[PDB]
Amino acid sequence: SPIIQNVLSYITEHFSEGMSLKTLGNDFHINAVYLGQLFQKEMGEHFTDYLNRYRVNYAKEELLQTKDNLTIIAGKSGYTDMAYFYRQFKKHTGETPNRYRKIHQ
């Protein structure tokens, strides 16, 4: 099992919890800088950009499947910084969260 496979699978299991190269490095006992570099090499993008797309893809479905609160949904998607969530959702869907909800729900 190459390291990259283990990390990719780990994201699927834990995407909603606090996660970074540093927490992954600690969990896997592997140098965090190297983990980031290996990720950039194999995936063609930064770890955080992959993780944001993954989280936003969850958020966008949760926004349509529920009438639950937006901040609550961001929390369930792995965001604690709401300004950051707002930026990231816009980046990965092309729309603001509540606009996306409006167009598609």
Domains detected in the chain? 1-55 (1.10.10.60), 56-105 (1.10.10.60)
Residue pair 93/100 in contact by the 8 Å Cβ criterion: yes
> CA–CA separation, 6 vs 82, rounded Å?
29
Calculate Rg over the CA atoms of the chain.
15
> CA–CA separation, 52 vs 39, rounded Å?
14
Residue pair 97/57 in contact by the 8 Å Cβ criterion: no
Query: What experimental approach yielded this model?
Result: X-ray
> CA–CA separation, 7 vs 27, rounded Å?
10
Query: Long-range contacts made by residues 79-84, C-beta under 8 angstroms, separation at least 24?
Result: 79/55, 80/18
Which class for 38: exposed (0-12), middle (13-18), buried (19 or more C-beta within 10 A)? middle
> CA–CA separation, 90 vs 100, rounded Å?
9
Declared resolution, Å? 1.6
Helix (H) or strand (E) holding 68: none
